[PDB]
Design a protein around this ligand. Structure first.
Ligand SMILES: O=C(Nc1nc(-n2ccnc2)c2nc(-c3cccnc3)sc2n1)C1CC1
Ligand SMILES: [Mg+2]
Length: 194
């Protein structure tokens, strides 16, 4: 359950004190975007550091399934869910659900099939069912997660360089995947595309 991971966070995400786990959180969201890219659907991934020390990742793939509790929610709220959807990003067997369970807030926005969907979680818990919130022609998935300050302790702020270097590496391992980093705190931006 998501409680298993709040109980023993380090074991799932890395060391929650020294900043390792807190940065690892980003790469267990990006992991799925790189996979969407690798399956041929996702062309670009925008990773963003927000003034409030949240990190959003936006892809332009198919958009996590919305059908039904919804598919999306299953993925977000069940540890094993990810296996129902040989390359890169994250640690084998860890999906976005670990990220959600360790985030005080996570906002999910899916653009799929002419419609925008939004949903918010607190500490893993959905605030409402996934819901339609307008029309769009774009497709993609967007996760914005605010790390729990109940889990991550000393290093609590995302460090642009740690992110930059690993995103560049990931885009190099996966030729053609366009990864962009943006930092809204200072305007700093990079594009990684081999
Ligand atoms: O999670 C992301 N994208 C994503 N992730 C998926 N996923 C799969 C397992 N955990 C996350 C995912 N699955 C997709 C899918 C799966 C089956 C049919 N159609 C679409 S699109 C997609 N898109 C982006 C924000 C980082
Ligand atoms: Mg993973």
């Amino acid at each position: 359950g998501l409680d298993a991971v709040r109980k023993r966070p380090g074991m799932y995400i890395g060391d929650t004190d020294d900043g390792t786990g807190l940065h690892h959180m980003v790469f267990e969201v990006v992991d799925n975007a790189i996979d969407e890219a690798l399956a041929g659907h996702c062309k670009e991934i925008i990773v963003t550091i927000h003034a409030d020390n949240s990190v959003s990742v936006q892809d332009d793939g198919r958009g996590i399934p919305t059908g039904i509790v919804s598919a999306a929610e299953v993925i977000m709220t069940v540890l094993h869910a990810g296996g129902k959807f040989k390359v890169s990003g994250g640690l084998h067997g860890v999906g976005v659900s670990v990220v959600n369970a360790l985030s005080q807030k996570l906002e999910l926005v899916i653009q799929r099939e002419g419609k925008i969907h939004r949903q918010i979680y607190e500490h893993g818990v959905p605030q409402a069912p996934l819901a339609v919130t307008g029309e769009t022609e774009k497709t993609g998935t967007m996760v914005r997660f605010w790390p729990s300050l109940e889990t991550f302790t000393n290093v609590t702020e995302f460090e642009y360089e740690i992110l930059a270097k690993r995103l560049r590496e990931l885009s190099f391992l996966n030729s053609g995947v366009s990864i962009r980093l943006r930092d809204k705190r200072d305007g700093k931006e990079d594009h990684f595309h081999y």
